[PDB]
Curated annotation (Swiss-Prot), chain A:
The lineage of its organism: Archaea, Methanobacteriati, Methanobacteriota, Thermococci, Thermococcales. Belongs to the universal ribosomal protein uS9 family. Keywords: Ribonucleoprotein, Ribosomal protein. InterPro entries: Ribosomal_Su5_D2-typ_SF (IPR020568), Ribosomal_uS9 (IPR000754), Ribosomal_uS9_archaeal (IPR019958), Ribosomal_uS9_CS (IPR020574), Ribsml_uS5_D2-typ_fold_subgr (IPR014721). GO terms for biological process: maturation of SSU-rRNA from tricistronic rRNA transcript (SSU-rRNA, 5.8S rRNA, LSU-rRNA); translation. Gene3D superfamilies: 3.30.230.10. It holds the Pfam family Ribosomal_S9. Residues 116-128 have a biased composition (Basic residues). GO terms for molecular function: RNA binding; structural constituent of ribosome. Part of the 30S ribosomal subunit. This is Small ribosomal subunit protein uS9. It comes from Pyrococcus furiosus (strain ATCC 43587 / DSM 3638 / JCM 8422 / Vc1). GO terms for cellular component: cytosolic small ribosomal subunit. Residues 104-128 are annotated as: Disordered.
Curated annotation (Swiss-Prot), chain B:
It comes from the Archaea. Pfam families: Ribosomal_S17e. The keyword Signal does not apply. GO terms for cellular component: cytosol; ribonucleoprotein complex; ribosome. GO terms for biological process: translation. Part of the 30S ribosomal subunit. The gene is rps17e. Belongs to the eukaryotic ribosomal protein eS17 family. InterPro entries: Ribosomal_eS17, Ribosomal_eS17_CS, Ribosomal_eS17_sf. One of its GO terms (molecular function) is structural constituent of ribosome. This is Small ribosomal subunit protein eS17. Keywords: Ribonucleoprotein, Ribosomal protein. The keyword Ribosomal protein applies.
From Swiss-Prot, chain E:
It holds the Pfam family Ribosomal_S14. Zn(2+) binds at C16, C19, C34, C37. InterPro entries: Ribosomal_uS14, Ribosomal_uS14_arc, Ribosomal_uS14_CS, RIbosomal_uS14_euk_arc, Ribosomal_uS14_sf. One of its GO terms (cellular component) is cytosolic small ribosomal subunit. This is Small ribosomal subunit protein uS14.
Swiss-Prot record, chain F:
Keywords: Ribonucleoprotein, Ribosomal protein. Pfam families: Ribosomal_S10. Involved in the binding of tRNA to the ribosomes. Residues 33-59 are annotated as: Disordered. It comes from the Archaea. The lineage of its organism: Archaea, Methanobacteriati, Methanobacteriota, Thermococci, Thermococcales. Belongs to the universal ribosomal protein uS10 family. GO terms for biological process: translation. This is Small ribosomal subunit protein uS10.
Amino acid sequence: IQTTGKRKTAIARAVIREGKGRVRINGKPVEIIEPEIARFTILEPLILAGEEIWNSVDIDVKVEGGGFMGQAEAARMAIARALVEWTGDMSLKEKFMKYDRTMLVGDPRRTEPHKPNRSTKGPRAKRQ
Amino acid sequence: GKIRQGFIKRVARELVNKYPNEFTTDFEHNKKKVQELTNVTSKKIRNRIAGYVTKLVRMKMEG
Amino acid sequence: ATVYDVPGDLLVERVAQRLKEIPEIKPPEWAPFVKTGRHKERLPEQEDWWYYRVASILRRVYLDGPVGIERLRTYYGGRKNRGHAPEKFYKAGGSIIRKALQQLEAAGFVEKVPGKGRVITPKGRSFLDKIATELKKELEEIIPELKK
Amino acid sequence: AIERYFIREAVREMLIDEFLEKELRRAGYGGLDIKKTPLGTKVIIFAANPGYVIGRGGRRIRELTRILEKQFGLENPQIEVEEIKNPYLNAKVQAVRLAQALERGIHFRRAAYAALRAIMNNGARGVEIRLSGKLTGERAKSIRFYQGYLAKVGNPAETLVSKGYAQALLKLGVIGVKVAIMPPGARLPDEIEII
Amino acid sequence: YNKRKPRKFGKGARRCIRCGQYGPIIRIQGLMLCRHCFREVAPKLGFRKY
Amino acid sequence: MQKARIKIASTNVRSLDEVANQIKQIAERTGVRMSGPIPLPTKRIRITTRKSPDGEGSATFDRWELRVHKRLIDIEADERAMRQIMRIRVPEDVTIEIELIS
Amino acid sequence: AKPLNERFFIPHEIKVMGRWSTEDVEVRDPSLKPYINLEPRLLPHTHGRHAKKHFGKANVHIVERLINKIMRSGGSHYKVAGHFMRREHRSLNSKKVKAYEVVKEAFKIIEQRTGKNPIQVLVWAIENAAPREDTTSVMFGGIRYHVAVDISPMRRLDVALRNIALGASAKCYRNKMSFAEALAEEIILAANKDPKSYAYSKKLEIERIAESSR
RNA sequence: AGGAGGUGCAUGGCCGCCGUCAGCUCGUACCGUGAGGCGUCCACUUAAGUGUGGUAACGAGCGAGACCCGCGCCCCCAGUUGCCAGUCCCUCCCGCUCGGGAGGAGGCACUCUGGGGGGACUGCCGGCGAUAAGCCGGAGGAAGGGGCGGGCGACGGUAGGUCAGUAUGCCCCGAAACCCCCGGGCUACACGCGCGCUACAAUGGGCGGGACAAUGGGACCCGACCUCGAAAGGGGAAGGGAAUCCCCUAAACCCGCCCUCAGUUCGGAUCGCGGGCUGCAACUCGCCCGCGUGAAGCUGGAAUCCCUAGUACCCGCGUGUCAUCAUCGCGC
C-alpha cells in the first residue's frame, strides 16, 4: 500500500506491506539516522500505534526535497497516513489527532517571496 | 472587511422579487439557480450572490 | 547485510584500518606536506589521514556508482574564510583524490567506465559488504534492535 | 534556442512599427501585422488613409518595399494596405489626429471638444483626453476632458481600453496628448444582466 | 583615422538598439536595449505584469 | 514501427489549444493511434528593471514575465495521417517542430 | 555511539527527551497549573501554529519553551552591567539541534548534581523566579504617575524563563565555563532562592520598586 | 551636421513622495446678494466616500472593492517526469540461504508536470448588534470572516529629479562646445559622515564520516568524463540549442577524536617571494594558489533603526553588469 506526504519542499513516498517490522528511509534503517532530533520525530507516530502493528508490517519510504528536518516531517506525515490506511481503525486516528492534528492534515506553510530593498535578507527586512 | 458589495446587494433584490418561489434556504440549491439566471463568469461572485440570496430567503419567512 | 545498514562514521574507520594492510595504497612523498583541501587552512592533525581518504572514496563508489574526478572534488570541498569578506564554499584539490583513485583501481577493488567515472568491482563489493556484515554482526550485540 | 527566436521576431516586429510611425505619420499610421509563408513575409498595414501611403502610382510603397527588405532583412516582403474599420475606435489614430490638428495651430479647446464629440458620435462608450505642456503661457499646464464611462486601473483597464500618446511640435516647444477610448463592445466584470 | 575602435568587450562593446545609450544594456537572451527603453516597449513585446 | 514527435510552442494557451484540437481530431478521423498531449513545464522568463529613469528617488522595480507553453504530441507513422498536418492553419504566435524517430 | 542509540530507544515508552517522564513532576503554585503544559511527548518541537493563536503558548511544552528562550540570546538593547551580550560565533538562532543538545547536557548536569528529576528542579526554579508585582504609568490630565500592578500568570512564566536564559547566557559569555554548565548552575541556584541566580535576583528587584510605587 | 554645451522655475513623457491614502468630482433641484454651501452631513460598521438608518436633496462618474497572477485540498484528462508501486523474467553482491541490496524488461500506481471543474459562500449554530448593516464565539473542513501573498495606485501638488537615454522650445560654439587616437584622472587623503562585511572566540579552531534545495542559466556555451599539476589551472572530450547533457554538491546540523579560555592555538589587515588566470596591456588600476607576517578589536556612552509566522535571526545558492572582478542589486 502506497502513501504520500509533502512538507516545505520535502516529498515522501511510502510503501508498506506485511513484514517483520523493519523500517527503512531511503533504504537506510530508521534507527541509525545520524540526526537524533530528526530520528525522534520520525519514530514519534508509531510509538502510539503499539509494537504489535510495528512488528506486523514492513515500511519503506523514499524522501526528496527540502532539508533533513523537512524530510523527517514528511516521512512521519506519510507514515501516519499509510498506517491508518492499513488499519482503517478510528481509535488510532483519534489518538493521532489528540497528539497532533497534522498527522493526517499537514502543514501548508510555504516560504514568502523576498521583496526588493535588500532582497537577500527577506520579504520584511529593510535598511535603516 | 466582510461588508457585502453594493451591486451584489442591488442585484439580489431582483432575483427575489421576480422568482420568489424558485429559491430556498439551501445554499447549494440557490447556487445553481443564480448560476443559470445570470451570466456570471466569476465563480467567486457567484458564491457571493448565492450567499446573499440565501440570506434574503432566510429573512423572508421571518417577516 | 550492506553498507546502508551501518553508520558511515565507524565504517570509514574500519575500512581505513583494513586497507592499511594492503600495500597497493600508499601516501606519496608529497602527501604529508599538503593539507587535505584548498578549502582547508591547516594541515591534518593525524598522520592516518591518507588511509581514511581512500576509505571515504571507495565508500562513495559503493553508493554513487560511476563518479569522476570533479564531482568527487566537489563533495570534499568545503567552507573557507576570505578575509573580512564572509566565508565561501570551495573545491578540494584534484591530485589528492586522483592518485587515490589510481591506487584503488590498481588494487582491483574498482574499475573504470570511461565517460562516466569509476564503478566498484564485485571483489570490492564483496570486501566492503563483508566488512559491513562484520560490523553489523558486532553491532547487533551491543544494539539488539538491529537484528530486525 | 527557441526563446532566442520568439523575442527576436518580437523586437523586429516593433522596430518596423516605430519606423512606419516616423514615416506614415501623415496618413494616420494605424496598426501593423505580419504573417510568414514560404513565399516570404506578408505585412498588413491598417492606415487611416492608404491613398497617401500609396503616394503616386505605388512609388511610395515601392520605396517602403525596399528598405523594409534591407534595413530589417525580411525575406521577400509583400505589403498590403487596408483601411481602419473605425479610426474613432483607435486611440493611437485619434491621438495623432488631434496632435496634427494642434500642429495646424487650431485652438486647443476647440479641437479637443470637436474630436471628443466626433469619437463619441462614432459609438464609443467613454473617452479621456489629457493635454500637457505650454498651452497658454511660459509655464506648463495640464488639462483633462472626459466623457462617458472609463475604468482606469486593474486588469480590465489594461485590456479593454485603447491607449494612445502623441507629441505635437510648435514654435514654443512640444505638447503631449493622452487619449483613452473605451469601445462599445467591451463589458466590465461588474456588469451583470438578468434573464 | 576617424573610425572608432571595434570593442569586443567593455561597456563600449554593447549598444542599446533604440535610443543609442552606452549605459545599462540588458542582454536577457540578447535584447541590446537600454533599461529606460525596455519600459516603453515591454507591453509591445507581449510582456505582462503579474 | 516508426513514430513522429511533434513539439508545439505557443505564448498563447488558446492558440495552442485549438491547434492541439486539430491534430487530435486528425487522429480518430485517420484511425491512427495517438498518445495523449503531454504538457511540458511552461517556461517562465523574468526580467526586472528599476522604474526610475534617473538615479534620484526611492527604489522601485518592474518585473515583466513571459510564459511560453510547450506541448508534445507523439503519433504513429501513417502517410495519410502526416499528409494532413502541413495543411493545418497555424497562427503566427504558434510554432511547430517535428522530428521523425524510430 | 552506544549512548546515542540508547537514548534513542529508551524513551520508546513516551518520555520527554530521553528520560524523566513527567508524572512525578508537580506544580505546587496554583496559578501556573492551568498554564504549564505537562502533556506526554517524545520530542518537544512542534513547529506548530502556536504563534498564530492568542494563547497558543498554553499548548507548547515547557521544555520546548525553554529551548525557544535559549534560541534567542545575543545582541539587543539590554546591556547587563555594560555588556553587549552578542553571539557572533555560531549563534543559537536557526540552530535548534545545538540548543537541544545543550539543554540535554544541562538536564543531565542538573540531575546528577541534585540526584532527582531535573524537570522538577526547573519547575521549582520557575516557581521561585516568578515576580508578583510590577509598575505602570497612569495619567490624568497629563500628570503621569507610577501605579503598582499585578501580572497575568503567563507573563510571569515568560519573564521567568527569559531571565533564567539571560543569566545562563551572561554567565557563559567570554568565559572558560561552557554554556550548558552555566545554564544548569543558573537553574540550580534559582530552584532554592539563592540570590546569585540572575533570574532570582532580578525577580527580587522587580518585586521591589513596585513595592514602594504603590 | 554635431555638442553627456547651458536652460528640469522653456517642455514632453518618466520617476520619488504626499499615498493603497479615503479621497476627488459632476447633471438637475434647493439656500445665499456673493465668494460659495447641500449632496460629500448625523449614530453604528468598514481595510474604504463600504454599507446600514435619519437628512433638502436624487442620481451618476473617477477612486475603493470587484478585476487579474502565484500558493494552499479535491475530481477528470494527459504520459519518453517518477518507480523492484506490483512485477512473473534475467544478472550480480552479501548472508545465518530465511532473507538484504543493485541493474534491464515492465505497466501506469504514485510523484512531477499543464488543461478543464469543484471546494470556502458569514456556508450553518449560539450570542452581541434596534430584529438593519455588521461584529464576536462554536462546529466541521486542507483552507473562514477581504484564505494567504502579490499586480493594478485617481483628482492635484511637490517649478522635487530626469533635458547626462530617448523627443524637445530658447540661447552658445559650430576646424569648436564637432569627430578619432594616445596618456593620465574619474580611487588620489589628517578626517566628519550614511549604509554594509569581519573581529572581538567554547559557541570556537583542526581531522574524517553521516542526512538533506530551487530559483534559474548554458553554443566563440554548460561541460560530465579521462589525464596531469598540491593548486591556481593545463590537453582531450561524451551529452546537450534543452523535462532527457551540465552547472550539481547542499550549508546551516550531528556523529568519533585533539587543542582548553589566552589578545591567544581568535582575528587577519599590512608587508616579500614564486606560481596560476582573463584581457593588447591589469604600478596608478583585477582575482586566485603555497610559504613567512601578524595589525586593532576582548561587547562598544549620547542616540537610534527593523520586525509580528516559514515571520524575525543563522546558513548558503542562482541571476544583471561581466573576458576577470560583489561586503553590489534581484530571486531561490
